[PDB]
Structures are given as C-alpha cells and as structure tokens.
Amino acid sequence: EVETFAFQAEIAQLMSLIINTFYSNKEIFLRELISNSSDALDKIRYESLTDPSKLDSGKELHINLIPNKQDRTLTIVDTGIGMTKADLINNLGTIAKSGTKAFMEALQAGADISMIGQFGVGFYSAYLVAEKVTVITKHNDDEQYAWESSAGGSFTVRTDTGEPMGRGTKVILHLKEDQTEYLEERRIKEIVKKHSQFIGYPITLFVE
Amino acid sequence: EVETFAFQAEIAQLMSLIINTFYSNKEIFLRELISNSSDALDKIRYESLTDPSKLDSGKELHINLIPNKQDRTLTIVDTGIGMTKADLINNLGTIAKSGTKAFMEALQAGADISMIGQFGVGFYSAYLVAEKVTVITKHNDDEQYAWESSAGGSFTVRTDTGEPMGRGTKVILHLKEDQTEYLEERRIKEIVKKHSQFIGYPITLFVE
Numbered sequence A, B: 001e002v003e004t005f006a007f008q009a010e011i012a013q014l015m016s017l018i019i020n021t022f023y024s025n026k027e028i029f030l031r032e033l034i035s036n037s038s039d040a041l042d043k044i045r046y047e048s049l050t051d052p053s054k055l056d057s058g059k060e061l062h063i064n065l066i067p068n069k070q071d072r073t074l075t076i077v078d079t080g081i082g083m084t085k086a087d088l089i090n091n092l093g094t095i096a097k098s099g100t101k102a103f104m105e106a107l108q109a110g111a112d113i114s115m116i117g118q119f120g121v122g123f124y125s126a127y128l129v130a131e132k133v134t135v136i137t138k139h140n141d142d143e144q145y146a147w148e149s150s151a152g153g154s155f156t157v158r159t160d161t162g163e164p165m166g167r168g169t170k171v172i173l174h175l176k177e178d179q180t181e182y183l184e185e186r187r188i189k190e191i192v193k194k195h196s197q198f199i200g201y202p203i204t205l206f207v208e
C-alpha cells in the first residue's frame, strides 16, 4: 500500500544544500509555500472560466494557515487545482532537474537562497524549518494521496483514506525543535504582512 | 476571416489606466514579457518530461529579442507551449478579470504599476511603450493564430497563414514614436541585465 521512491540526483543535492548551508533568513519558506498555493488557485480559476463544473468540488478559493503547538506542526491549506499521483512523483509538479541546475549556478553569480522561487523549486525551502513534510492533495481527475519525506534521498507515496477534502493541497510542516517561533500568532502575522500582503486570495490565520 | 471582440470591462479599464497614468519607469514592460515567456517554456518542459513527443515541434527552449528600426518594432520570441484559439480569446490565457480587481485595489494600499506581474496581468504593461501589439502563437493542439489590439476597448483574432513557426509565441511591439530607446543595442542590454539576469533560458539579443 506504500510505495518508496528515490529523488533524482539534482533534487537530493538541493535538499542537502538547504539543510546544511548556514543561512539565517529562514522566514522565506512561508512566502514560497503561500506563493505556490496562490499559483494552484490561479490554475483552477482559469479552468473554471470555460467549464464551470470543475468548481463542483468546492466553490471557494482560499489559503489557511493552521498552527498546532501539540503536534508541533504548521499546516498551509489551499483549495487549488491539486496534484495527480503522477504530479506528486514528478517532483511535486515542478521542473526540478533543470530548475536546480539554474539555481545552483545562480549561486555562482552571487545570488542567495531567498531567490529559490525564481527557479521554480521553492517548495523545498520548507526544509529550512521542517524536519518532515507531509503533502496531502486531491485533484478532480484522480483520488486523494499523501506524499512524505524527511530528506535522506527518498520520498513515499500512499493513497490517503483519512479526511476527504474535496479539492486542493495541504502542506504539513513537522517543524525542527528549534523553529517553533513559526507557530506564534504574532510571528506568522508579521511574516504574512512583510512578504505576502498582495496575494489575491484571502489568507485566514487560525488561532488555537 | 477576421473576428472582432470586446475586452471585458475590467481589462478595458486596466489598459486605459496603463496608457493614461503618468508613470516614468516604463522599462519594466520587458521584465514582464520575458517573465511570461519563461513561464510558457516551463510549461512545455513539464509536459515533455512525460510525453517526449510534445517536443517534436522544436527541441530548443529559448527567448530572442529582435529590434527593428525600420518598422519601429521590438519582437520577443519564445518557443514555449503556445496558446490555443480559446486561450487567445480568454485574455491571452490569464485570469484578467480577478487579477485586475486585486491589482486595482493594490493601488489602494500604496503599491505602484511595477507590481503588475504579481497579479498575473503583466502582458498589458506592453502598453507602457507600444501603440499596437500583435501576438503570433502556435500550440501543438491547434493552428497558428494572430491576435491584435491598439486598445480602444477591442481586439481581433485571425488565423495566420504567414510564417509557420512550429511552436511558441511572438509578441510584436509596434512602439510609440517617443519610445525608440528600446530599440537600442545598449539600452536593451542594460534592462536585461538589471531585471532578468537569472532567467533559466538563453536570451539572444539580435543585432541589425
């Protein structure tokens, strides 16, 4: 029921760079993950303009941020277009092989890690703060699946018989023991205002 | 053989804002149009990773910038994924109705016109410098078409029996009589280095 996979060599390389490189401005992870959800929401909005029944699986387009101090997680939920099984396998629907290449050689021209969005592999900045990332996704054209990794050079894909969700994607960050400041009402507020104030969709910060 | 269309009200509104608003930093148009081609190239790269025959219509992924002083044009060419007829009609494959809304109210929160990319309607900044824009496009799943507008609240779509191009999109800017500095070898070089130095694809500046 659980399939295990090896990251392509270039992505494994990137993930190891992100975990090991001394770099203080970790807060950008949220900008990047919010930005990816906004892009998924654009995609089902475009699609629905021609066939309005794509929105049958949930008529609202939004982003939610859910801190939990017990499980030491922060969840980012969107009701975007979602990913198909094959999407999950193909580096979470990105061009990671070529994107990592362009990024790696952009650190040759003096650029720093905050520029990771510009290359299209910004999802992996989640490894600035998380020790394990579980992505749950449901796309109209397929079933619900769960993807999971703690780096190490491999990820798993199972089908998910937990919570039906209708449509979208959930990125559960299981945070590193020294990064719990990103569970703080105050601190998430500041980061959302600094780096994400003009996102076209409503962002609800949940309270505990 | 030539169909004429009315822009939706919100897009007409935006275009009129871009043409009339006093605003000096016009140079961003190139950043935005380059950025859109990069996004089209990402899309056929993603597609080709699963079915490699999508690249049968041209194996190279690149951007070219072509100044012409005679016809007073600057052409930006990419061999991206291209647009289908319906794409051309739907605001050049963008979410323009909602995007213009989010943008218009972002000028309520102090943001300026250079932030147009963040809302997904950056193609229209071309109206900072061009008086007429002709877009030529060929997508694997359809024929070659030509879209054209001088604003005025309407655009045309004809099928194009000029140059076969295989796959991609060409954005011909017919420049305003006072914006010919964007035909200068020197000046295009500076703008590409300032705002576009980390684009993952090769950009060839043609010389005349």
Ligand SMILES: Oc1ccc2cn[nH]c2c1
Residues within 6 Å of the ligand: A032, A033, A034, A036, A037, A040, A078, A080, A082, A083, A092, A123, A168, A169, A171
């Ligand atoms: O951070 C991410 C990464 C991938 C997807 C797909 N949908 N939403 C996402 C968010």
Ligand SMILES: Oc1ccc2cn[nH]c2c1
Residues within 6 Å of the ligand: B032, B033, B034, B036, B037, B040, B078, B080, B082, B083, B092, B123, B168, B169, B171
């Ligand atoms: O500036 C643009 C706008 C739309 C498309 C589509 N493909 N390439 C483009 C460039």
Ligand SMILES: [Cl-]
Residues within 6 Å of the ligand: none
């Ligand atoms: Cl983008």
